[PDB]
Symmetry: C2
């Protein structure tokens, strides 16, 4: 039977990324307590915990905690310099996302991209750019569609292959 | 010989919309003088006046002056209520763009979409959201790609068919 198409995977990315952000933020609160950076937008976003995509984004947040520390530490330092406008956010997002996939696609790099979206969203919020988390979501969804990441994931069996 | 593909047209939209915005803003300055709403972002954006897409966006700005007055007057009134965040801008953009093409595609509706992008960009700038004109450009480019407007234009002979 047919598994998810490129188009279905590309649509699914919205929910995977929202779920990743939610559970990653929850994990950061668990690990850092009152030291965790505040972003109420990441607590209140749309969530369907029991859905397959909700489960996938959660699992990527969990495994990301252990495999993404390298990509992450740098992201934090290399974002301190970004200005809170939509254009600067887009330009930075696009340069870094492009660099992550220059030598091909793998699951660790997909998780890195989700984590970079997370850090970017958090940074712009901390610098006063509210109402932008949906925009970072759309940056991620659209980048993965047009840069053939959704196609690659469909070829691996869809987002469920990440469970 | 092959004319522009869907993909080529979709890419061309960036330059068409930037050129439309530039020349429409110039026309508004010519018609309104010191009454024209200020948006320096629309004067300094990237422009290639002699290119085909630069010529097309200019022509759409000119013919738009006479055919878009209906769509426009309403846009101005119905945007007064939009809040300056990326999310609200996206949600409004998407609702209105969707409504414009619900009963199909024609050139007047394509110009209406460019004009709505113009008004939205101007509104959010006037309400303090700077650095967002590229974002409205990307809303327009991506909407026209995924809503098969670029495909329709390719079927008409490409953006040059609008000259
Ligand atoms: Zn797209």
């Amino acid at each position: 039977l047919p598994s998810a198409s490129e188009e279905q995977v590309a649509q699914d990315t919205e929910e995977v990324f929202r779920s990743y952000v939610f559970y990653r933020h929850q994990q950061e609160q668990e690990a850092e307590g009152v030291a965790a950076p505040a972003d109420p937008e990441m607590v209140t976003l749309p969530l369907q915990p029991s859905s397959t995509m909700g489960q996938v984004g959660r699992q990527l947040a969990i495994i990301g905690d252990d495999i993404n520390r390298r990509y992450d530490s740098e992201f934090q330092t290399m974002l301190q310099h970004l200005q809170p406008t939509a254009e600067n956010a887009y330009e930075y997002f696009t340069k870094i996302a492009t660099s992550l996939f220059e030598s091909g696609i793998n699951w660790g790099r997909v998780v890195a991209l989700l984590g970079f979206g997370y850090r970017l969203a958090l940074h712009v919020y901390q610098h006063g750019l509210t109402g932008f988390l949906g925009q970072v979501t759309r940056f991620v969804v659209d980048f993965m569609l047009h840069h053939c990441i959704a196609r690659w994931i469909a070829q691996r069996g869809g987002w469920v292959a990440a469970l």
